[PDB]
């Protein structure tokens, strides 16, 4: 119902934070730094939560609403997946190659949802 939208400045600024943290996650995947995934995921989650808060809850333009849940949904999945690097009992096996792909996939989804939001927001802010 609320079509108020954040500042373009603000979105970009928050977008840059998300992108920086996900980049750090990517490098750690490339580096097989699996013990970095949980702290990276925390930083991404924070960054996501702040960007989603630039918009009113139940905002108005449908594509803003579609993008936000996908942004929020994906941040939630990334955190969950990342915790799985920590096995059930100590010295339990972990399929790190599969998990890492699941992790990166989730990160893709975040970047995707963020760009969607950037695109709609920068756009609506002209006419």
């Amino acid at each position: 119902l609320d079509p108020g939208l954040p500042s373009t400045e603000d979105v970009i600024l928050k977008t840059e934070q998300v992108t920086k943290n996900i980049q750090e996650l990517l490098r750690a995947a490339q580096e097989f730094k699996h013990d970095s995934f949980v702290p990276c995921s925390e930083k991404i989650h924070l960054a996501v939560t702040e960007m989603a808060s630039l918009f009113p809850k139940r905002p108005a333009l449908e594509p803003v609403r579609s993008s936000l849940r996908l942004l929020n949904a994906s941040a939630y999945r990334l955190q969950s997946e990342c915790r799985k690097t920590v096995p059930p009992e100590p010295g339990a096996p972990v399929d790190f190659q599969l998990l890492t792909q699941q992790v990166i996939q989730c990160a893709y989804d975040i970047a995707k949802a963020a760009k969607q939001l950037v695109t709609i927001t920068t756009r609506e802010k002209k006419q």
């Binding site: 979105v11 970009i12 996900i22 980049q23 990517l26 490339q30 996939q105």
Partner: peptide
């Protein structure tokens, strides 16, 4: 926001390439 999106597209290309090697 173009550069915002370009930086996002840059990151998405990198992530999906990691998924395609």
């Amino acid at each position: 926001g173009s550069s915002a999106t370009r930086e996002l597209d840059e990151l998405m290309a990198s992530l999906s390439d990691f998924k395609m090697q």
